[PDB]
Amino acid sequence: DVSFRLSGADPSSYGMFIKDLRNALPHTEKVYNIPLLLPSVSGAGRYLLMHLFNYDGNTITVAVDVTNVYIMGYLALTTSYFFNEPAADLASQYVFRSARRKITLPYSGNYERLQIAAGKPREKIPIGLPALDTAISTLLHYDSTAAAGALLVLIQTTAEAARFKYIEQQIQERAYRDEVPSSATISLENSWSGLSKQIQLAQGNNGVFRTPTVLVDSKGNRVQITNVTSNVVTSNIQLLLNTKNI
Ligand SMILES: *[C@@H]1O[C@H](CO)[C@@H](OC2O[C@H](CO)[C@@H](O)[C@H](O)[C@H]2NC(C)=O)[C@H](O)[C@H]1NC(C)=O
Ligand SMILES: OC[C@H]1O[C@@H](O[C@H]2[C@H](O)[C@@H](O)[C@H](O)O[C@@H]2CO)[C@H](O)[C@@H](O)[C@H]1O
């Protein structure tokens, strides 16, 4: 398991937790030096448990699918909560079985279903460590509407941060003050799948992408990614979604 506590948390411990989060996911091959996520894992081992503690010390345990880094659900005291999606339902057969009751959310974990449930896009939802403390707090007590938004904060603080160093960096700048995500952040989140595909396809195309990826950069400008020499591939992306899942 991996853990993070917001009490006493700073850019340092956050980075360490994100480093752990990354190291917890297994892989057998690296593509252009980037861990390649497995096509699939069978049974309970398919899920990674993250113990998160808010500033007061309360905790929720989040189950993550180690093949894609998708959040399946979490445990709040003695109640389990899982998205309304096949994968999560499957996940419920293995994790938090001893919870006293199981609640299925009214939506899947997809960014689009989450934004609807929440009544606003990620664009306008401030993130950072403080925001992650709010999120943990919200999920301790069931509220599907407040949860959608806390869940959008959680996904980005943790899964997207493991996925991209840049996003991990974005969150460390927000260690003591939340801020809506830069568009480069939303761009990267939206492009993880495609970038993972083209990184793997480049492998026998001499590091050239079969199809270029369009991103938005730091300065907020439209940019094309055509091959593995881009900083995005050399520095940024830290985990790759196996094409066997794309
Ligand atoms: C792969 O991607 C490279 C940049 O990420 C790109 O190099 C450049 O493209 C032109 C030069 O002809 C410039 O617009 C740009 O400044 C160049 N970037 C750098 C840092 O040199 C390669 O040309 C791309 N290769 C392929 C096969 O498309
Ligand atoms: O949308 C980002 C979000 O991914 C969720 O999974 C989605 C997925 O993007 C889509 O291909 C599919 O049709 O719905 C999936 C779940 O039902 C994750 O659960 C989440 O953790 C985010 O990364």
How many angstroms separate the CA atoms of 180 and 133, rounded? 16
How many angstroms separate the CA atoms of 135 and 147, rounded? 8
How many angstroms separate the CA atoms of 120 and 12, rounded? 31
Listed residue (4, 38, 9, 8) closest to 21, CA to CA: 4
Ligand 2: centre distance to CA 8 (Å):
31
Based on the residue annotation, tell me whether 160 is a catalytic residue of this protein: yes
Cα torsion through 151, 156, 161, 162, rounded to 10: 50
Distance of CA 112 to the CA centre of its chain: 15
How many angstroms separate the CA atoms of 39 and 18, rounded? 22
Ligand 1 pocket: which of 195, 198, 226, 228 to mutate (most atoms <8 Å of CB)?
226
> DSSP class of residue 143?
-
Tokens 């998708």, residue located: 70
Using an 8 Å Cβ cutoff, are 127 and 180 in contact?
yes
Using an 8 Å Cβ cutoff, are 36 and 68 in contact?
no
User: Closest ligand 2 atom to the C-alpha of 71?
Assistant: 21
Ligand 2: centre distance to CA 89 (Å):
14
Residue whose Cα lies nearest atom 23 of ligand 1: it is 226
Q: Which of 85, 160, 168, 189 is catalytic?
A: 160
How many angstroms separate the CA atoms of 236 and 238, rounded? 6
Residue 195's CB is within 10 A of a number of other CB atoms, namely 24
Amino acid making up residue 7: S
Cα torsion through 86, 46, 38, 233, rounded to 10: 90
Ligand 1: centre distance to CA 235 (Å):
16
Q: Residue 212: enclosing H or E segment and its boundaries?
A: strand 208-216
How many angstroms separate the CA atoms of 161 and 155, rounded? 9
Nearest ligand to the C-alpha of residue 226?
1
Using an 8 Å Cβ cutoff, are 145 and 118 in contact?
yes
How many angstroms separate the CA atoms of 150 and 131, rounded? 8
Q: Method of determination?
A: X-ray
| Residue 83 CB partners (closer than 8 Å, separation 6+) | 71, 72, 73, 104, 105, 107, 108, 109
How many angstroms separate the CA atoms of 216 and 222, rounded? 5
Residue whose Cα lies nearest atom 3 of ligand 2: it is 110
User: Closest ligand 1 atom to the C-alpha of 208?
Assistant: 27
Ligand 1: centre distance to CA 131 (Å):
38
Cα torsion through 13, 17, 23, 26, rounded to 10: 180
Nearest ligand to the C-alpha of residue 114?
2
Q: How many CA atoms lie within 13 A of 47 on its CB side?
A: 22
| Domains, the chain, ordered by start | 1-162 (3.40.420.10), 163-246 (4.10.470.10)
The helix/strand/coil state of 110 is coil
How many angstroms separate the CA atoms of 66 and 184, rounded? 25
